[PDB]
Amino acid sequence: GKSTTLFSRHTKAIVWGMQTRAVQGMLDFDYVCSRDEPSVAAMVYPFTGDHKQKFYWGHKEILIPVFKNMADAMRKHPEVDVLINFASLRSAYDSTMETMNYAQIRTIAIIAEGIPEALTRKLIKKADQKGVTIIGPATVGGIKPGCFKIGNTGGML
Amino acid sequence: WARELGLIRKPASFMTSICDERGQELIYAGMPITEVFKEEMGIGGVLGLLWFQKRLPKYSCQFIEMCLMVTADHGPAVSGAHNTIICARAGKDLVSSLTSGLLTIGDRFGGALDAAAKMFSKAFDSGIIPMEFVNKMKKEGKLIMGIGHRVKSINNPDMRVQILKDYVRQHFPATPLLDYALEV
Amino acid sequence: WARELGLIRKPASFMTSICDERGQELIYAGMPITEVFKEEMGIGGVLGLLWFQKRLPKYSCQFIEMCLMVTADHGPAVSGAHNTIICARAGKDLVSSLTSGLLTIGDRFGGALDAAAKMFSKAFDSGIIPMEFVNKMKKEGKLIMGIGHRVKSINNPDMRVQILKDYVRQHFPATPLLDYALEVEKITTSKKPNLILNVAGLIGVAFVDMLRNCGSFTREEADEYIDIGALNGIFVLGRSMGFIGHYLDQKRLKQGLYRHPWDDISYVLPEHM
Amino acid sequence: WARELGLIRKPASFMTSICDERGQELIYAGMPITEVFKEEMGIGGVLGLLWFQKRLPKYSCQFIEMCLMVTADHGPAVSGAHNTIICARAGKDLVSSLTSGLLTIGDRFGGALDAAAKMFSKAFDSGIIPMEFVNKMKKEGKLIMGIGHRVKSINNPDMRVQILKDYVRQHFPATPLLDYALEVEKITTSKKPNLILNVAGLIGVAFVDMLRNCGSFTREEADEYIDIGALNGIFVLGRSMGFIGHYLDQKRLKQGLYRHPWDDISYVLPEHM
Amino acid sequence: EKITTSKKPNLILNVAGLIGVAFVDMLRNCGSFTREEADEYIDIGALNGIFVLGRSMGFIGHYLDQKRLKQGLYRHPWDDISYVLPEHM
Ligand SMILES: CC(=O)SCCNC(=O)CCNC(=O)[C@H](O)C(C)(C)COP(=O)(O)OP(=O)(O)OC[C@H]1O[C@@H](n2cnc3c(N)ncnc32)[C@H](O)[C@@H]1OP(=O)(O)O
Ligand SMILES: CC(=O)SCCNC(=O)CCNC(=O)[C@H](O)C(C)(C)COP(=O)(O)OP(=O)(O)OC[C@H]1O[C@@H](n2cnc3c(N)ncnc32)[C@H](O)[C@@H]1OP(=O)(O)O
Ligand SMILES: CC(=O)SCCNC(=O)CCNC(=O)[C@H](O)C(C)(C)COP(=O)(O)OP(=O)(O)OC[C@H]1O[C@@H](n2cnc3c(N)ncnc32)[C@H](O)[C@@H]1OP(=O)(O)O
Ligand SMILES: O=C([O-])CC(=O)C(=O)O
Ligand SMILES: O=C([O-])CC(=O)C(=O)O
Ligand SMILES: O=C([O-])CC(=O)C(=O)O
């Protein structure tokens, strides 16, 4: 069952890939929205070891964990309910399918351009089965002013 | 001026957590230097503060000092001391000679400490009995790191292994890996 | 005098095969220095004699000189040049500054040469097609070393990958590993344009081709020379030129001691230990 | 953002003038890398651009290459090669072994280049005749650096001093300091034959002559480059080739860890302290 | 130090100068050394070795801290470097 609400002031998301500019814009949007916590809890990048990337919370310095594996990110952050998939057209399908195995993820945002229609169709079928709302691929994402921002939606600050 | 007014952001390119040079007092991983000397720390305590950021007990600091004492020198025949002497006889520098000597510290010379530690830690965590560990390392073909001397065999130990071992029995609370290594 | 008359037998503790100081003439790997200069080989020929004990062809020596040239320096912002400049501004020494700069030459900085060469050689020897190699690298969470550039891409090449590549095509007899790397580059540029063959990757694959394609070496010799770190020595020798240039520039500019700003450190010391 | 828009103003903590990594093309002190490869300058030209920021003539670059060639390696018995071999037989690293070998250079091993150059430059600038120079050196208990060889004296010259000297006569426009050093050599050989111009002294005087005889440099620039240790860099860069060759040779021969024998150490420790 | 603080208040005996003078005193005011032995040990660089050995602890601590923090490769920003390369050489 797809919920009628997707984003709130307590929504936590996991970003797939090195998109430090997008995540920094997300954090700036959260700060100017008077959010208690940043909307990005962790990043997933398979081509590097687990570490902490340095980001800005307003003027303060914070560290956001980066995990080589998605399973570690879902394990250590059970409060995350949104995935923002920055994988390319060759990796968006597999990343989304692997994320769908985790029941904590309720909304998946796919940014990639050029995903084959069959693969997106399969993703739609599995999302309908699992009750996961997918912000369809080839999108910038979405904005909920005061609550949450997806990727680079809304431009710069 | 802009930073003082809080007008701009610039991410810091570095990150340190061992020493705080700025401020009124020098700080070693949270402990001021005056508190360092009042607590009667030694080289071991300062080493623990700078390397582990921990307030080690007195016996731990004394054991670290003893380890530094026993590894101070082992003669000029080793590779590092040889290189240091070669660079010194060239009349180069203290720093350069020390550097040339220290650059030989690696797998074959000086790396037996870390290699033995990793070897015995892996063997202990694997849960295999010491006899099984010895048989496995015989069959696989790697020498057991930290085992084997040239001339001092029995009734005449290294005699600086004895000092550290006696200290560890006397002061260390629990020594499971030491007992495993002694069984090996 | 006993050694002169040979009444005693003492085995030698060392063994060298690159240079012979003793005798009426200085000898480089069995060839006199005067013969070295009459043959008109340059830095590349002496490098080949000292490192491989082989009489390399003229094009191989020129290619080695080219590789030393292109890796001479890449600005002061790299780790090694930064360390050399810091040591020079401390007024220490030429040798000490070069030393401090060269000590950063390792896996993350300067080791892309050997890593790329080893990876491409392993892929070529395994017999897998370049697409299979790309997929294998992708599924193992490993980036193809020697592939990808900062700003350069297709339709805007490196301008020093191009020169070395043109020399290799014009002069090298056969370059199978270079062709394999070019197919890999063609596959990776279809993903995003900036995924072109690096200077490190191109030099590594061309050096492997020069080792295992000229008549000087056998396959075992070339593999052993790659393993022991011949390309690491190539990069170190090339970048020492730029490091010494940095030291001389810092000395000429009379720069004072460097004292890193506090506002770029972000002390994260514990509350109380 | 504030720096691009020019609202703020932050002083730069570093200054460089040898290489420009940024941009669409690598630049070696004003000259693009492609242009560096167009006029066919080699190791000498790149070295001149990086160290002196000058477009040296072809003969100067070739002479620099020759100087690197003759100082490439001089056997394993020297202190630096010995240290490199010791660090290699410990199986440490290429960079570490080269580093340990290089760290011995500067005072008694490899320091004769700069010392001889400075001594002969001071003698020539002081205006004293070579005989007065020899008398002054003798009276103050100093040996002339770069004068005096081991075995090869006359009718059998160094055979690599000869190559460089012949090149200098053939291609250098004017070499007053070389003539002064040769007069000093003529005076010293009348004392005993082995008092000839060494490769260190010959290279030093010819390098000073190249610096202050080609149109690239003024007298002040040449003097400053000599003072800051250009010849030390020349020797170190040349000998790095031989040191890396020694490391590769030791790796190829698979020599084990070296420990100096006790019968050669002669412990003189005190009775009890 | 009294004279220099009379000149400017922050011209105090540094830790370097204090350690140097106290180490010279320890060398030449203890029964272990004669005056020439202390002079020779000062000349050959005993305090250089003292400083190097002391600061080695801090340098190894810095290395361990950087390894534990898993800091990535450093590249100095281009805005902090002044390129004064010649027009064309
Ligand atoms: C800093 C320090 O204190 S040094 C620390 C070095 N760490 C090590 O122990 C490395 C491995 N061991 C060694 O090399 C020992 O120090 C050495 C030098 C005594 C061994 O050198 P050797 O001359 O081979 O000793 P020895 O001749 O008695 O060894 C003979 C046999 O013992 C075995 N052996 C030697 N060392 C070890 C070891 N550490 N573990 C298991 N077996 C060993 C050898 O396999 C050899 O096999 P063999 O029975 O087929 O001949
Ligand atoms: C010898 C060689 O060519 S290095 C060989 C390396 N080979 C490999 O490891 C292959 C693996 N590939 C990779 O890791 C990557 O594809 C790379 C590193 C090769 C390509 O670089 P990227 O990952 O794009 O990062 P890059 O090095 O461009 O740096 C990021 C940005 O910082 C900028 N930057 C670089 N150096 C500096 C500096 N000193 N100061 C300020 N900014 C800088 C760059 O301009 C770049 O921005 P751009 O993309 O708009 O040009
Ligand atoms: C080992 C030691 O104890 S140091 C030994 C030094 N040797 C000597 O004593 C030789 C003679 N002494 C001197 O030359 C001088 O008295 C010195 C250099 C020791 C001190 O003089 P100063 O220039 O006043 O000290 P310093 O250079 O640290 O001053 C820089 C100022 O910026 C600050 N500062 C220092 N380093 C940094 C940095 N990396 N980032 C930001 N700010 C800094 C300091 O707080 C200091 O404060 P101020 O603005 O009130 O002066
Ligand atoms: O130097 C030491 O500590 C002793 C040593 O490694 C050896 O066994 O040769
Ligand atoms: O290693 C080099 O050639 C320098 C380099 O690519 C960089 O880090 O900018
Ligand atoms: O002649 C050289 O090149 C330097 C050298 O090795 C020596 O003789 O000590």
GROMACS .gro file of N, CA and C in nm, chain C residues 13-19 21 24 28 34 36-37 41 43 46 50-51 53 66 69-70 72-77 82 85-86 89 94-95 98-99 102 105 150 152 156 159 225 228-229 233 236-237 241-242 244-246 249-250 252-255 258, chain D residues 13-19 21 23-24 28 34 37 41 43 50-51 53 65 68-70 72-77 82 85-86 89 94-95 98-99 102 105 152 159 163 224-225 228-229 233 236-237 241-242 244-246 248-250 252-253 258:
model
  357
  354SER      N    1   7.973  -1.092   0.020
  354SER     CA    2   7.841  -1.074   0.079
  354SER      C    3   7.743  -1.002  -0.013
  355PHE      N    4   7.791  -0.942  -0.121
  355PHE     CA    5   7.707  -0.866  -0.213
  355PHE      C    6   7.719  -0.921  -0.354
  356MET      N    7   7.637  -0.866  -0.443
  356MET     CA    8   7.634  -0.911  -0.583
  356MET      C    9   7.572  -0.799  -0.666
  357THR      N   10   7.648  -0.744  -0.760
  357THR     CA   11   7.601  -0.638  -0.847
  357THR      C   12   7.626  -0.676  -0.993
  358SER      N   13   7.541  -0.623  -1.082
  358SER     CA   14   7.552  -0.655  -1.223
  358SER      C   15   7.524  -0.537  -1.316
  359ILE      N   16   7.514  -0.415  -1.264
  359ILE     CA   17   7.473  -0.301  -1.346
  359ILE      C   18   7.591  -0.214  -1.386
  360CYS      N   19   7.690  -0.198  -1.298
  360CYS     CA   20   7.799  -0.105  -1.323
  360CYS      C   21   7.928  -0.161  -1.265
  362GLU      N   22   8.284  -0.016  -1.152
  362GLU     CA   23   8.372   0.098  -1.129
  362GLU      C   24   8.519   0.059  -1.143
  365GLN      N   25   9.017  -0.018  -1.589
  365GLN     CA   26   9.067   0.097  -1.664
  365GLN      C   27   8.956   0.185  -1.720
  369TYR      N   28   7.907   0.026  -1.803
  369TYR     CA   29   7.763   0.023  -1.777
  369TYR      C   30   7.707  -0.107  -1.833
  375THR      N   31   8.270   0.509  -2.309
  375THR     CA   32   8.303   0.567  -2.439
  375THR      C   33   8.220   0.504  -2.549
  377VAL      N   34   7.928   0.384  -2.492
  377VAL     CA   35   7.795   0.438  -2.464
  377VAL      C   36   7.776   0.571  -2.537
  378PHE      N   37   7.879   0.656  -2.536
  378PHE     CA   38   7.866   0.786  -2.601
  378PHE      C   39   7.883   0.779  -2.753
  382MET      N   40   7.335   0.700  -2.779
  382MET     CA   41   7.219   0.685  -2.694
  382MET      C   42   7.222   0.790  -2.583
  384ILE      N   43   6.972   0.959  -2.234
  384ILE     CA   44   6.930   0.916  -2.101
  384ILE      C   45   6.858   0.783  -2.108
  387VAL      N   46   7.120   0.479  -2.136
  387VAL     CA   47   7.187   0.454  -2.009
  387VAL      C   48   7.088   0.398  -1.907
  391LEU      N   49   7.136   0.040  -1.725
  391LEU     CA   50   7.147   0.031  -1.580
  391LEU      C   51   7.031  -0.046  -1.517
  392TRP      N   52   6.911  -0.039  -1.575
  392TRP     CA   53   6.793  -0.097  -1.512
  392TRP      C   54   6.760  -0.236  -1.564
  394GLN      N   55   6.981  -0.406  -1.812
  394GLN     CA   56   7.101  -0.470  -1.867
  394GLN      C   57   7.079  -0.515  -2.011
  407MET      N   58   6.097   1.022  -2.348
  407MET     CA   59   5.967   1.088  -2.360
  407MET      C   60   5.885   1.070  -2.233
  410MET      N   61   6.011   1.281  -1.969
  410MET     CA   62   5.978   1.421  -1.996
  410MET      C   63   5.835   1.453  -1.954
  411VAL      N   64   5.739   1.369  -1.993
  411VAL     CA   65   5.599   1.401  -1.969
  411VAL      C   66   5.566   1.393  -1.820
  413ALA      N   67   5.774   1.486  -1.584
  413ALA     CA   68   5.872   1.569  -1.515
  413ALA      C   69   5.809   1.645  -1.399
  414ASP      N   70   5.700   1.716  -1.426
  414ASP     CA   71   5.630   1.790  -1.322
  414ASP      C   72   5.485   1.811  -1.363
  415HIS      N   73   5.397   1.820  -1.264
  415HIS     CA   74   5.255   1.843  -1.287
  415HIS      C   75   5.203   1.945  -1.186
  416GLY      N   76   5.278   2.053  -1.167
  416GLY     CA   77   5.235   2.160  -1.080
  416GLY      C   78   5.278   2.141  -0.936
  417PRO      N   79   5.262   2.246  -0.855
  417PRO     CA   80   5.303   2.240  -0.714
  417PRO      C   81   5.196   2.190  -0.618
  418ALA      N   82   5.074   2.165  -0.666
  418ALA     CA   83   4.963   2.130  -0.578
  418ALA      C   84   4.957   1.982  -0.545
  423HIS      N   85   5.415   1.956  -0.306
  423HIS     CA   86   5.381   2.029  -0.185
  423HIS      C   87   5.481   2.001  -0.073
  426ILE      N   88   5.815   2.164  -0.148
  426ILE     CA   89   5.811   2.308  -0.125
  426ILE      C   90   5.811   2.337   0.025
  427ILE      N   91   5.740   2.257   0.104
  427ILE     CA   92   5.740   2.278   0.249
  427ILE      C   93   5.880   2.259   0.305
  430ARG      N   94   6.107   2.557   0.189
  430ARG     CA   95   6.078   2.679   0.262
  430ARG      C   96   6.123   2.672   0.407
  435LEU      N   97   6.867   2.055  -0.057
  435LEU     CA   98   6.816   2.001  -0.183
  435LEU      C   99   6.783   1.854  -0.170
  436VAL      N  100   6.877   1.776  -0.115
  436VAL     CA  101   6.855   1.633  -0.099
  436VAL      C  102   6.738   1.607  -0.005
  439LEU      N  103   6.399   1.709  -0.190
  439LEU     CA  104   6.369   1.605  -0.287
  439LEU      C  105   6.324   1.477  -0.218
  440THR      N  106   6.390   1.442  -0.108
  440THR     CA  107   6.357   1.323  -0.033
  440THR      C  108   6.216   1.329   0.023
  443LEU      N  109   5.969   1.293  -0.259
  443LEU     CA  110   5.963   1.160  -0.320
  443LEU      C  111   5.902   1.057  -0.226
  446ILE      N  112   5.556   0.943  -0.304
  446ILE     CA  113   5.533   0.863  -0.424
  446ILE      C  114   5.494   0.723  -0.380
  491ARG      N  115   4.059   1.475  -1.535
  491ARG     CA  116   3.999   1.587  -1.463
  491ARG      C  117   3.903   1.665  -1.552
  493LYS      N  118   3.988   1.680  -1.923
  493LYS     CA  119   4.006   1.628  -2.058
  493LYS      C  120   3.909   1.514  -2.085
  497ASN      N  121   3.860   1.657  -2.678
  497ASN     CA  122   3.950   1.749  -2.609
  497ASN      C  123   4.056   1.666  -2.537
  500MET      N  124   4.676   1.612  -2.488
  500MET     CA  125   4.787   1.684  -2.552
  500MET      C  126   4.925   1.635  -2.507
  566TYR      N  127   6.023  -0.751  -1.447
  566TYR     CA  128   6.058  -0.610  -1.439
  566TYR      C  129   5.936  -0.525  -1.406
  569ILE      N  130   5.862  -0.597  -1.016
  569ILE     CA  131   5.955  -0.537  -0.920
  569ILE      C  132   5.945  -0.386  -0.914
  570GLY      N  133   5.875  -0.322  -1.007
  570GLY     CA  134   5.850  -0.180  -0.997
  570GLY      C  135   5.934  -0.093  -1.089
  574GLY      N  136   6.000   0.328  -1.069
  574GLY     CA  137   6.126   0.398  -1.088
  574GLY      C  138   6.120   0.500  -1.200
  577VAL      N  139   5.936   0.798  -1.056
  577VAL     CA  140   6.015   0.866  -0.954
  577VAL      C  141   6.126   0.947  -1.020
  578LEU      N  142   6.195   0.887  -1.117
  578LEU     CA  143   6.302   0.958  -1.187
  578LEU      C  144   6.247   1.077  -1.265
  582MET      N  145   6.286   1.542  -1.132
  582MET     CA  146   6.321   1.662  -1.207
  582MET      C  147   6.235   1.780  -1.163
  583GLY      N  148   6.103   1.760  -1.160
  583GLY     CA  149   6.013   1.866  -1.117
  583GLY      C  150   6.029   1.901  -0.971
  585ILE      N  151   6.315   1.886  -0.792
  585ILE     CA  152   6.434   1.968  -0.781
  585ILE      C  153   6.408   2.107  -0.838
  586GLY      N  154   6.331   2.115  -0.946
  586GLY     CA  155   6.292   2.246  -0.997
  586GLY      C  156   6.212   2.326  -0.897
  587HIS      N  157   6.120   2.259  -0.825
  587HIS     CA  158   6.044   2.326  -0.720
  587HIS      C  159   6.134   2.374  -0.608
  590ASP      N  160   6.323   2.676  -0.732
  590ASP     CA  161   6.233   2.791  -0.741
  590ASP      C  162   6.204   2.849  -0.603
  591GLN      N  163   6.179   2.764  -0.504
  591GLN     CA  164   6.153   2.813  -0.369
  591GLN      C  165   6.275   2.882  -0.310
  593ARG      N  166   6.509   3.037  -0.488
  593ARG     CA  167   6.528   3.162  -0.561
  593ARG      C  168   6.426   3.268  -0.519
  594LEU      N  169   6.302   3.227  -0.492
  594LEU     CA  170   6.200   3.321  -0.445
  594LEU      C  171   6.219   3.362  -0.300
  595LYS      N  172   6.311   3.297  -0.228
  595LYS     CA  173   6.343   3.331  -0.089
  595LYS      C  174   6.219   3.324   0.000
  596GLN      N  175   6.139   3.219  -0.019
  596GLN     CA  176   6.019   3.201   0.061
  596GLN      C  177   6.055   3.159   0.203
  599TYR      N  178   5.683   2.791   0.619
  599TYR     CA  179   5.539   2.780   0.603
  599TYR      C  180   5.476   2.742   0.736
  627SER      N  181   4.943   3.162  -0.007
  627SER     CA  182   5.054   3.121   0.078
  627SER      C  183   5.169   3.058   0.001
  628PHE      N  184   5.153   3.033  -0.129
  628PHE     CA  185   5.256   2.968  -0.208
  628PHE      C  186   5.279   3.043  -0.338
  629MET      N  187   5.401   3.035  -0.389
  629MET     CA  188   5.440   3.097  -0.515
  629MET      C  189   5.523   2.997  -0.595
  630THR      N  190   5.488   2.979  -0.722
  630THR     CA  191   5.558   2.886  -0.808
  630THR      C  192   5.579   2.949  -0.945
  631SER      N  193   5.689   2.911  -1.011
  631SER     CA  194   5.720   2.965  -1.143
  631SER      C  195   5.777   2.862  -1.240
  632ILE      N  196   5.766   2.733  -1.211
  632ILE     CA  197   5.828   2.632  -1.296
  632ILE      C  198   5.726   2.557  -1.381
  633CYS      N  199   5.602   2.541  -1.334
  633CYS     CA  200   5.505   2.458  -1.403
  633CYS      C  201   5.365   2.509  -1.374
  635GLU      N  202   5.005   2.347  -1.398
  635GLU     CA  203   4.927   2.226  -1.424
  635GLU      C  204   4.787   2.260  -1.473
  637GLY      N  205   4.467   2.461  -1.660
  637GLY     CA  206   4.447   2.500  -1.798
  637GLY      C  207   4.425   2.381  -1.889
  638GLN      N  208   4.412   2.413  -2.018
  638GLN     CA  209   4.386   2.312  -2.120
  638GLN      C  210   4.512   2.241  -2.168
  642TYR      N  211   5.550   2.406  -1.912
  642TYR     CA  212   5.678   2.397  -1.842
  642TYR      C  213   5.747   2.533  -1.849
  648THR      N  214   5.339   2.047  -2.565
  648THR     CA  215   5.345   2.018  -2.708
  648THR      C  216   5.457   2.095  -2.775
  651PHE      N  217   5.783   1.944  -2.701
  651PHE     CA  218   5.813   1.832  -2.790
  651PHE      C  219   5.827   1.872  -2.936
  655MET      N  220   6.369   1.950  -2.806
  655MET     CA  221   6.452   1.951  -2.686
  655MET      C  222   6.422   1.826  -2.604
  657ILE      N  223   6.585   1.569  -2.252
  657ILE     CA  224   6.599   1.578  -2.107
  657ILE      C  225   6.667   1.709  -2.068
  664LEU      N  226   6.262   2.362  -1.634
  664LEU     CA  227   6.212   2.344  -1.499
  664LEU      C  228   6.302   2.407  -1.394
  665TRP      N  229   6.434   2.407  -1.415
  665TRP     CA  230   6.526   2.451  -1.311
  665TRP      C  231   6.565   2.597  -1.325
  667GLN      N  232   6.414   2.815  -1.590
  667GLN     CA  233   6.312   2.890  -1.663
  667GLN      C  234   6.371   2.959  -1.786
  679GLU      N  235   7.248   1.669  -2.059
  679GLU     CA  236   7.221   1.527  -2.075
  679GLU      C  237   7.347   1.444  -2.056
  682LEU      N  238   7.432   1.421  -1.691
  682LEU     CA  239   7.348   1.319  -1.628
  682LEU      C  240   7.395   1.179  -1.666
  683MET      N  241   7.443   1.162  -1.789
  683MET     CA  242   7.490   1.031  -1.835
  683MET      C  243   7.614   0.986  -1.759
  684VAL      N  244   7.712   1.075  -1.742
  684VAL     CA  245   7.839   1.034  -1.681
  684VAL      C  246   7.829   1.017  -1.530
  686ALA      N  247   7.558   0.886  -1.390
  686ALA     CA  248   7.448   0.793  -1.369
  686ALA      C  249   7.480   0.692  -1.260
  687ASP      N  250   7.595   0.626  -1.270
  687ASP     CA  251   7.636   0.529  -1.170
  687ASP      C  252   7.788   0.515  -1.173
  688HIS      N  253   7.845   0.492  -1.055
  688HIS     CA  254   7.989   0.473  -1.040
  688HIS      C  255   8.016   0.358  -0.943
  689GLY      N  256   7.946   0.247  -0.962
  689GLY     CA  257   7.970   0.127  -0.885
  689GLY      C  258   7.889   0.121  -0.757
  690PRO      N  259   7.882   0.003  -0.696
  690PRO     CA  260   7.803  -0.015  -0.573
  690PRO      C  261   7.879   0.010  -0.444
  691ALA      N  262   8.010   0.032  -0.449
  691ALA     CA  263   8.089   0.048  -0.327
  691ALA      C  264   8.069   0.184  -0.262
  696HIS      N  265   7.563   0.174  -0.168
  696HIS     CA  266   7.564   0.076  -0.060
  696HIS      C  267   7.436   0.086   0.023
  699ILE      N  268   7.143  -0.052  -0.174
  699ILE     CA  269   7.145  -0.198  -0.176
  699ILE      C  270   7.101  -0.255  -0.042
  700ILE      N  271   7.146  -0.194   0.069
  700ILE     CA  272   7.106  -0.242   0.201
  700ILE      C  273   6.955  -0.229   0.219
  703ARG      N  274   6.779  -0.497  -0.005
  703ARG     CA  275   6.788  -0.634   0.045
  703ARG      C  276   6.701  -0.655   0.168
  708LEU      N  277   6.108   0.055  -0.357
  708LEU     CA  278   6.192   0.131  -0.450
  708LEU      C  279   6.216   0.272  -0.398
  709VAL      N  280   6.109   0.340  -0.357
  709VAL     CA  281   6.121   0.478  -0.311
  709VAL      C  282   6.207   0.484  -0.186
  712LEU      N  283   6.586   0.411  -0.285
  712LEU     CA  284   6.640   0.530  -0.350
  712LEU      C  285   6.660   0.643  -0.249
  713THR      N  286   6.565   0.660  -0.158
  713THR     CA  287   6.573   0.765  -0.057
  713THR      C  288   6.694   0.745   0.034
  716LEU      N  289   7.006   0.826  -0.154
  716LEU     CA  290   7.023   0.968  -0.184
  716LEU      C  291   7.061   1.048  -0.060
  719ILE      N  292   7.417   1.187   0.009
  719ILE     CA  293   7.480   1.277  -0.086
  719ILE      C  294   7.483   1.419  -0.030
  766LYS      N  295   9.417   0.652  -1.281
  766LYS     CA  296   9.434   0.696  -1.419
  766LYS      C  297   9.479   0.841  -1.420
  773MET      N  298   8.873   0.921  -1.946
  773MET     CA  299   8.798   0.865  -2.058
  773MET      C  300   8.651   0.901  -2.052
  777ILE      N  301   8.553   1.290  -2.278
  777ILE     CA  302   8.435   1.307  -2.362
  777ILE      C  303   8.370   1.442  -2.337
  838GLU      N  304   7.368   3.300  -0.848
  838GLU     CA  305   7.264   3.255  -0.757
  838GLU      C  306   7.231   3.108  -0.779
  839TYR      N  307   7.224   3.064  -0.905
  839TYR     CA  308   7.193   2.924  -0.933
  839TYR      C  309   7.305   2.833  -0.884
  842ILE      N  310   7.268   2.824  -0.488
  842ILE     CA  311   7.154   2.750  -0.433
  842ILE      C  312   7.164   2.600  -0.454
  843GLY      N  313   7.262   2.553  -0.531
  843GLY     CA  314   7.286   2.411  -0.542
  843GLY      C  315   7.233   2.346  -0.668
  847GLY      N  316   7.172   1.927  -0.747
  847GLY     CA  317   7.059   1.866  -0.816
  847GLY      C  318   7.101   1.786  -0.938
  850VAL      N  319   7.248   1.459  -0.806
  850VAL     CA  320   7.147   1.374  -0.745
  850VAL      C  321   7.058   1.312  -0.853
  851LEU      N  322   7.016   1.393  -0.950
  851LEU     CA  323   6.933   1.340  -1.058
  851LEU      C  324   7.008   1.238  -1.142
  855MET      N  325   6.945   0.749  -1.125
  855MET     CA  326   6.935   0.642  -1.224
  855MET      C  327   7.013   0.519  -1.178
  856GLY      N  328   7.138   0.539  -1.136
  856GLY     CA  329   7.218   0.427  -1.090
  856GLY      C  330   7.164   0.365  -0.962
  858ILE      N  331   6.842   0.353  -0.866
  858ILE     CA  332   6.725   0.273  -0.902
  858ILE      C  333   6.769   0.146  -0.976
  859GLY      N  334   6.873   0.157  -1.058
  859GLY     CA  335   6.928   0.037  -1.120
  859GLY      C  336   6.981  -0.062  -1.019
  860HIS      N  337   7.048  -0.012  -0.914
  860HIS     CA  338   7.095  -0.099  -0.807
  860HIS      C  339   6.979  -0.166  -0.735
  862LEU      N  340   6.678  -0.232  -0.857
  862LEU     CA  341   6.619  -0.331  -0.946
  862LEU      C  342   6.709  -0.453  -0.958
  863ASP      N  343   6.841  -0.433  -0.961
  863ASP     CA  344   6.933  -0.546  -0.967
  863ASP      C  345   6.923  -0.631  -0.841
  864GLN      N  346   6.915  -0.568  -0.724
  864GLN     CA  347   6.904  -0.643  -0.600
  864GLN      C  348   6.772  -0.719  -0.593
  866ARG      N  349   6.606  -0.828  -0.859
  866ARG     CA  350   6.613  -0.935  -0.958
  866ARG      C  351   6.699  -1.051  -0.908
  867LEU      N  352   6.810  -1.021  -0.840
  867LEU     CA  353   6.896  -1.125  -0.785
  867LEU      C  354   6.837  -1.191  -0.662
  872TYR      N  355   7.065  -0.838   0.469
  872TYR     CA  356   7.207  -0.824   0.500
  872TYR      C  357   7.227  -0.786   0.646
   0.00000   0.00000   0.00000
